[PDB]
Symmetry: D2
Subunit: 392 residues, 4 copies
Amino acid sequence: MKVWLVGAYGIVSTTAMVGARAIERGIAPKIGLVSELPHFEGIEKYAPFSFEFGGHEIRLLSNAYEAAKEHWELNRHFDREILEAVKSDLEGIVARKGTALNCGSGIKELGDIKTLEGEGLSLAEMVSRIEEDIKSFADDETVVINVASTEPLPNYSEEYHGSLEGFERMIDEDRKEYASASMLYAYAALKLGLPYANFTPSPGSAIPALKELAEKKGVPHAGNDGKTGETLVKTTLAPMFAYRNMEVVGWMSYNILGDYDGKVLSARDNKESKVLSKDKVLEKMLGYSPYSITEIQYFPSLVDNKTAFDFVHFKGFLGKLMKFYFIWDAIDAIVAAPLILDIARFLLFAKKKGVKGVVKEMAFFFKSPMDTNVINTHEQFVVLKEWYSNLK
Amino acid sequence: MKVWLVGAYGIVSTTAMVGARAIERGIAPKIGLVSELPHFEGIEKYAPFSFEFGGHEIRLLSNAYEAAKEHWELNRHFDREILEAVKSDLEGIVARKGTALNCGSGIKELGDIKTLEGEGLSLAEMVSRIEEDIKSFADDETVVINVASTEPLPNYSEEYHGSLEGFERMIDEDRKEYASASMLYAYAALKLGLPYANFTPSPGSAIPALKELAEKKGVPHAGNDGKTGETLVKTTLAPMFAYRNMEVVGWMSYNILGDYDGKVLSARDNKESKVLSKDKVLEKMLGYSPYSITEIQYFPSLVDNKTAFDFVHFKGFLGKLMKFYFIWDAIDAIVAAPLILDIARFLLFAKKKGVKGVVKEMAFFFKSPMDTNVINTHEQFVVLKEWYSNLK
Amino acid sequence: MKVWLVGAYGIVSTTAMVGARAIERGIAPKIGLVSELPHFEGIEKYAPFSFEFGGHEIRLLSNAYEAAKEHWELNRHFDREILEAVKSDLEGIVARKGTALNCGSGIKELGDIKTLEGEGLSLAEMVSRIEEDIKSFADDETVVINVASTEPLPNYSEEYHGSLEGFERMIDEDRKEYASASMLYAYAALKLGLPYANFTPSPGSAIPALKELAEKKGVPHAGNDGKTGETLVKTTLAPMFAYRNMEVVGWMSYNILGDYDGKVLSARDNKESKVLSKDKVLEKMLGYSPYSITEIQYFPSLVDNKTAFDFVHFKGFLGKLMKFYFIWDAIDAIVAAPLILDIARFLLFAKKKGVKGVVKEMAFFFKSPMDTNVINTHEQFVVLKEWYSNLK
Amino acid sequence: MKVWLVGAYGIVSTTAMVGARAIERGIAPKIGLVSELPHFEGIEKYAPFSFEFGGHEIRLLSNAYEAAKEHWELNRHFDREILEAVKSDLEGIVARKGTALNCGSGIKELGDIKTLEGEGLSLAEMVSRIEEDIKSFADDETVVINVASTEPLPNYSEEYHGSLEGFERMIDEDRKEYASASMLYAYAALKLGLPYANFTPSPGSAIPALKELAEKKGVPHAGNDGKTGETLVKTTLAPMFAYRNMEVVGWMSYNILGDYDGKVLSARDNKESKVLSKDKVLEKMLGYSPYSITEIQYFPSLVDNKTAFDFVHFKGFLGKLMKFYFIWDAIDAIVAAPLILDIARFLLFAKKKGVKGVVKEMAFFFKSPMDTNVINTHEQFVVLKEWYSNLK
Ligand SMILES: NC(=O)c1ccc[n+]([C@@H]2O[C@H](COP(=O)([O-])OP(=O)(O)OC[C@H]3O[C@@H](n4cnc5c(N)ncnc54)[C@H](O)[C@@H]3O)[C@@H](O)[C@H]2O)c1
Ligand SMILES: NC(=O)c1ccc[n+]([C@@H]2O[C@H](COP(=O)([O-])OP(=O)(O)OC[C@H]3O[C@@H](n4cnc5c(N)ncnc54)[C@H](O)[C@@H]3O)[C@@H](O)[C@H]2O)c1
Ligand SMILES: NC(=O)c1ccc[n+]([C@@H]2O[C@H](COP(=O)([O-])OP(=O)(O)OC[C@H]3O[C@@H](n4cnc5c(N)ncnc54)[C@H](O)[C@@H]3O)[C@@H](O)[C@H]2O)c1
Ligand SMILES: NC(=O)c1ccc[n+]([C@@H]2O[C@H](COP(=O)([O-])OP(=O)(O)OC[C@H]3O[C@@H](n4cnc5c(N)ncnc54)[C@H](O)[C@@H]3O)[C@@H](O)[C@H]2O)c1
Ligand code: NA
Ligand code: NA
């Protein structure tokens, strides 16, 4: 299959590329791949473990190898021998110039960038470039996945975001104020009939306009925002207090990281998207709102080793308060990268099975799953299992 | 209903007694009670929140109030005002002298004790005293629950434990070497046609002899070993690594506590029962065995504030190792006490619904659930929900 | 001796009052009191353990007992029996209306308040009321200690803060914009010839004007900002990396608390004072600046149980990065309250020994010690010991 | 200078060798080296940063490079580029066959071993081989340092360990039952007039016989047992509670590690030496004994990444209990290796300054410092500083 990655030179993106190729060359295990679990036996009939890559970027380096090595230098999150073995393949992946339209002040932290809007192009002309890039790459086994820096919350508009006609009016009128990069890539993917997933908390396809578009075009889509670490634990663990009829009175979630993701989320406007997505899961699972605090702070020496500190304050029998702590110490690109490969395969599977619109049953992958109040990790896993069985 | 508690002066036992009465007098919330969750609406048709108590003990204090206050003095795990309000009721609960037969060297740590076997009685004569105590108390709405100190692993015997005839032969021949206290209380309960649950990792009714007996008598029973804290988290959290196709390579579980439970488990023979029950859950959930260490150590200043330290070492994409820590800081009697009330109500419900033999669907309460490989907390909760719906 | 407490109805203040009296009535140990350590034998010649209290407040409750009980209800940080035993004594402590001039937006969180500036008084007239209150209480064995809510960083002024003449000009001209409450109480104390200590990060006497005043008047003073918990650990532990020639690359300090202190510090202007005081210690000890983040967030269920989460990222041999975590779980009023009693006794001792100006050797008590670059806890303790020996 | 390392193929030993050479070739910083701190300016007059290595082993691999690479493969605790750069130098370091006499059951975990006692040699003949090996290597700038696996507590003997004549009688009579390997290497070093340090909790030179010998020979020696991680923190942090007049009621110290050190300490007899050395520090600092538990458990996936979990339970004002947690996550060979280089330089310095007998002022390096009750890390550092200034 083929995967077009928005933010193709990022660490999540390059590590998926490194991993896919290491696994194909037979020099890496299949650990981390949800699509490789026993329940999904037979997926390879529809989506074999076979990947060609391209994508859009605003940080233009020569190729995906140079991009992968920049992240490897700082993080060393896989062996030098894996880097070397996949060098050839990754040198042939060259990203195209994308758009950073309305992606917030945090984009400044990426350093030297070049964008379509910087060239003076209108919305219609930007869409045409994005579509031409994708369609020149795409086949009938192609998916588009957004793994680009997290945008701020969009300037929402009922007219421009509430219907497909309103959104196409937005493009026609060149109303840039209401367009964000993530919307434009999602729009392009679906207009081309390509399945789409948004691994970030940027709006992407999660506006009514684009949900209408995906349905009309009969195209499957999924999102939003990869559930990889702290939020994974929160949605696995919060149900335990509910099952035991305990009241959660407080939940603290504090996250420190560096690298480009920590750099972008250092900006208050970009951060808000990620923070709300991490925070809001609690009420959906419990039925009520514990006092919750969720923060992300830049902490440069950790690079992509995002570390989370959580504290849960809870009541039990007779009103007695009790306390639970956790620390997650993990590399973000290592828990994220396989989910990109899994999302791509499950979208391809969904496409071939005639699935259209939001694939709500892929909620398991996401912190803010579209079209569903199923948040509990256990419930989401059962939904994913049962969905695949129903269509297999 | 009526509940006969083996180990009636213990902290789990007295706090269930304090709690039941506080809730009946309308001075405490219903927090902590699984049987009070919305899904179990209508349980009160079969098992209303209404409790009379008695039980067996080897530490003879005057009454359950004096017992409750001894634990309250050291722990202050509920308000002085709750203690005062329930004093009358608890002063009327007087335990009967039980048996500490083959309950290990840790029983020495309980201080001043008096037992049936100390009086020179044979197995048959001990059984008669235990039965007379229970039957003088029991009605058609009576359950027996074991919350006594954890025994060592029994001297197992195919002849004496493998069939009811073999076990009754054991009693007839006065073969004390193969009898443990917990077996004798379980035997007595079931011979009397009373539902039974074992909240400890002592063998109790979990031998083939007594499982045969419960079936023959048409009596429901449940166990073993309350899942309250660290093991609750382990069975909620370990599935997350499986769902995400990660390999757990190591899991460390270190527990410190004081009070009478920490005192008994300071002995190496008593400890082994609790340790194996906490440790063995991992393989059943994952399909394989991470290097696991599970310890319990005495740490007197914590009293009944059992604190657990866990560390999970796990592999993800490309073989990368990553790390997860947790600390549970809770009072053991507060997470355990409501489960005693819930177990009693669900046993009464099961009894009235014609349920007989091991109620395997009550696995949710237990670290070592009888007759089931369902260990995942989420799965167990669904099984409990669905079981109750099926019989309601 | 006599202690006039600014913020007399606060939890630190009332717990010092509760503690002093419990210890005098012989119903509490002397644990927590630095002045009770063997090295300080003979202090009781100059400052016996004997305390009468008064102070200023803006939250007017009837008396210090009602104030103490309000905090006890929420926190239960000492026994009901201690509360009862000291009720009489504390009912006779009645605070006087003080000033909340330029104490930031966080003061709004205190609820119902009444202030001198609210009555329409000028700076000169406010100073006269504050002085009249203190002088009506004071004797030759009286000290004034600031334990009031943390102010924002002041609008600094060279003219008005840089010399005593400039500060007295400020009062004469009624230039309120440059006066803060803490400055006015410190000014009043020193004008009256009374020793002064500032337990908060508010400016207090730590401006050149008031340092000049204390010297001229021959009056000892000490501050700023009680070092009680997280910062205590930081100044004990950071030296270990220096002694071992390790580079600290990052230090994260995250603090959650409730109660009135957490409420006031929820405001961004008030918070800044506390944050800088906690953060700045690192460079002074190490000679360089690790990337440091220090936050305080409101977390209401913890009440006065301030909990801190720290993470230290450090380099050792060959550049290898390594990691250290800590969690402090303590009640803030319990670690602070004895230091108020100790500060008072050491100020009285200093006064009687002819000490004047900043008592820099009391740095041990403080996060931002005036007139000293001695920050290491070990060094500060030796300085305090040696100071007392020199004057004994 | 020259350093003869007992246990020369171990990870602490090989990493000191790797580090020394990387630093000499100018490809590594001097981070981690206490002897490189500003206070020790001028040490290079007596002990320049210049090292030639040899030693004894029982695991015979071809050379120290092969040994270093075996540990590097599993741990990756320095760059492949450092490994490559020092390969030549380390290939020329070839260990000689030593003795594992009475080194406990844990020695079995080292795999394929060869020893002097296995050849049938008497004590006198073993001593001669050990001496011949060392003297063939040694010059006037040579030190011997023990970094071999931790032995069990020795079979102590007043006659054989209490005087030099008694110890030499032991050798003469071939009384193996009372000799341990570490004693024999220490004996040989001192008989040869070479300074000696013991980085392990094995007895080494810490018996009266060998202390008498070092004095008579006018030879400086130091030990015992490198203070590198958890115990470093404990001796830095415990003084904080004393300075603040708090009572420590409980201290838990739980350590997990793998590699060869974790393997040897998995044995109960070997473990006891390390456990007592880690545990006993508390009383010496505080004056009393908190309930303390100290454990080390094998946890193979961590390899040389020893992780420690500590919990401190402490009383403060009015008897209130409060709680402090810490987690140390570090590589043991990285914190240990520079101390070997520092110990060697400070021993050479001591030798040239006419120092003889136990260098008690090197206590800073050690968990069980010989001839001193100075345990507090801060105090030890001041003692080391002042010692060096006095002799410089
Ligand atoms: N576990 C995880 O790492 C995880 C989990 C959930 C969500 N996410 C989200 O995934 C995204 C990727 O994470 P990452 O660590 O790879 O960050 P990264 O910064 O290393 O990668 C993002 C890449 O996208 C590029 N980019 C930014 N805006 C773009 C635009 N509009 N068009 C094209 N390219 C653009 C950047 O130049 C960068 O190379 C982030 O938004 C992050 O918040 C990551
Ligand atoms: N969260 C929890 O507290 C928890 C969880 C799982 C299992 N358990 C188990 O529940 C049991 C009770 O815990 P606890 O904290 O109340 O301990 P406890 O020691 O305070 O209570 C046990 C009581 O039973 C008595 N006893 C011991 N052997 C007896 C015998 N053979 N016959 C009659 N009485 C006997 C003791 O005197 C004591 O009063 C223990 O076995 C414990 O391991 C507790
Ligand atoms: N361990 C600790 O608790 C600790 C450590 C260091 C510093 N501090 C500082 O000590 C102070 C007291 O802490 P607390 O927990 O008692 O808080 P608290 O809010 O319970 O006490 C402060 C009291 O002062 C009053 N107040 C505020 N402004 C005033 C003014 N200008 N004049 C007179 N009264 C005023 C408030 O009404 C309140 O009763 C805070 O500034 C805090 O940041 C506390
Ligand atoms: N931070 C630390 O790593 C640290 C701190 C304090 C003490 N120590 C102690 O230092 C020692 C070395 O630690 P390591 O991690 O290098 O362990 P290691 O097992 O990797 O090294 C010990 C080496 O000595 C060898 N050996 C064992 N007995 C011997 C004998 N009698 N004669 C000659 N060689 C012998 C072994 O074969 C091995 O190569 C251990 O005793 C350990 O407990 C280490
Ligand atoms: Na805690
Ligand atoms: Na870690």
